Amino acid sequence: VPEAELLFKTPAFQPLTQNIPIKNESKKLSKFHVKIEGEWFHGPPILHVGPGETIQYPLTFKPILECEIMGKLTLQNEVDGMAHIVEIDGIGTKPIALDHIIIDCKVGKVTDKSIIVPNYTKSLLTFKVTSDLSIVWGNSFITIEPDDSIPYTLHVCPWKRGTFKGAIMFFVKSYSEEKVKALKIWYHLEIRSSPGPPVDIIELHCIAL
C-alpha cells in the first residue's frame, strides 16, 4: 500500500516522469498490462512485480500543442485480469501564437484555413464571432471539445485581388466558467490572392540579334 501515487503536471514538449505504485488484491504470477484511450500516453506492455515493492509501470506523455488530455486506463493481468482504475491528465502549452492563418489563393478563392485554438477547460466550449469584415466569417459556428486544442475552419478571402483589413475574435459559451469566458481569443490573418483578370493588351514586332 505504497501511496507514492502521483498525477502528471507538465507543459508542452516537456517529458515528465512520475510514479504510480499500486497494491494488488490476489496473488499469482505477477505480469501486468494496460489498455489506454488517450494520446501521448505511450508505455511499454509488460512489467513484473517483486517483493510487494513500491513498483511503477512506465507511461510517457509529450504534448506538442496547447492542449490537455484525459487518460483512460483499463488494466489487465496475465493470470486473472485484475485492474486498478486510476485516471490522470496530461497538459501542454505550445502556442504558435496559438495559431496563424496563412493562405495562398487566386481571385475569388475563399480558402478554408485551419486555426489551432486551445481548450483549457473541461466543458464543450462554443465560441461566438464578431468581426468588421464580411469576407472573414467562421465555419457556421465554432465549437471545441474540452482538453485538446481542436482546430477550426475559417473562410478568408477578399472578393478581388487585394486586402480587406478586419479584426476577428472569439468569445465563449460555457473548469470554471470564468476561465471559460475569459478565453477571449483574437486571431491574426494572412491573405495572398493572385492574378487575376487582365485589362490591357499591346502587340509589337521585333528583331532577332
Partner: protein, 246 residues
C-alpha cells in the same frame, strides 16, 4: 430498477444504436432506421479495421465501461447476434470466446445436468447478472405468451389476466423446433416490481413482491399476484425478473 419491456436483447440493441448516435452526433435520421445506420456504420467500420477488436481504434468512451459492466452472457443467444458480434467484436475476443464456451457449458447443463433452476435466493447473481422481462399494456385484461430462450428441454407459459400472473411449464402443448427433455423439476428466482408515474414525470407509487424463488414441475399450474387498475395508472407497465441456473 429499469422497467424492461422485455429482455436484455433489445436493451443492448438500443445501447448500440445510441453508441452510434453519441459516437457520431452528425446523424439526423430515424430511430428505427437508426438500427440500419448503426449496424452499417459499425459493421463496415470494423470490416475496415478487422482483426483488431472494437474499442482499440478510437471508439466510444462513455459506453465501453457500460458494456464491460453488462450482462453479456444471454444477449447473443440469437445466432444472428453471434454473427454480428463476430463482425463487431464489441467485447474483446478472449472474453468473447469465454462467452461462447460458457454458452456451451449451458448446453452441458441442459444435457448432462438436467438443470433445475435456482432452489435458493440467488439475489446477488439476480442483481448483477440475471435477466429481466416485463410488458406494457394498452388496456387492462388478458396478455399471455409462450416463453423461450435457453429452454433446456421445455418451454414456459406466463400469463397476465386481469392482474393474475399464471406460471405453467410448456413441455406438452405448444410446439417449437426446439428440444424436449426429461428434466422434471424447474425452478426460478423471480421478482415483480411496480412504480407508477404521470404524464409529466411525477412518480407516486412503488410495489415489489420481494425477491423470491419459484419452484415448478412439468406443466404445473401456479399463480400468485393481484392488483387494482382503478388505482394504477394506464397504459400500465410491469417489470418482472427471473433467473434459471443453479
Amino acid at each position: 430498477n429499469l422497467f424492461v419491456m422485455q429482455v436484455e436483447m433489445d436493451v443492448y440493441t438500443a445501447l448500440k444504436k445510441w453508441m452510434f448516435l453519441q459516437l457520431v452526433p452528425s446523424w439526423n435520421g430515424s430511430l428505427k432506421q437508426l438500427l440500419t445506420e448503426t449496424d452499417v456504420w459499425f459493421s463496415k467500420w470494423k470490416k475496415d479495421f478487422e482483426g483488431t477488436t472494437f474499442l482499440e481504434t478510437e471508439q466510444g468512451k462513455p459506453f465501453a465501461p457500460v458494456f464491460r459492466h453488462l450482462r453479456l452472457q444471454y444477449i447473443i443467444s440469437d445466432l444472428a447476434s453471434a454473427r454480428i458480434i463476430e463482425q463487431d467484436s464489441l467485447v474483446p475476443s478472449e472474453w468473447l470466446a469465454a462467452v461462447y464456451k460458457q454458452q456451451w457449458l449451458a448446453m452441458l447443463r441442459a444435457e448432462q445436468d438436467s438443470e433445475v433452476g435456482p432452489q435458493e435466493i440467488n439475489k446477488e447473481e439476480l442483481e448483477g447478472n440475471s435477466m429481466r422481462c416485463g410488458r406494457k399494456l394498452a388496456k387492462d385484461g388478458e396478455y399471455c405468451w409462450r416463453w423461450t430462450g435457453f429452454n433446456f428441454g421445455f418451454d414456459l407459459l406466463v400469463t397476465y389476466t386481469n392482474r393474475y400472473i399464471i406460471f405453467k411449464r410448456n413441455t406438452l402443448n405448444q410446439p417449437c423446433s426446439g428440444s424436449v427433455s426429461l428434466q422434471p423439476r424447474r425452478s426460478i428466482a423471480f421478482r415483480l416490481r411496480l412504480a407508477s408515474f404521470d404524464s409529466s414525470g411525477k412518480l407516486i407509487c412503488s410495489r415489489a413482491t420481494g425477491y423470491q424463488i419459484l419452484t415448478l414441475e412439468k406443466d404445473q399450474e401456479q399463480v400468485v399476484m393481484n392488483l387494482d387498475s382503478r388505482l394504477l395508472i394506464f397504459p400500465l407497465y410491469i417489470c418482472c425478473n427471473f433467473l434459471y441456473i443453479s
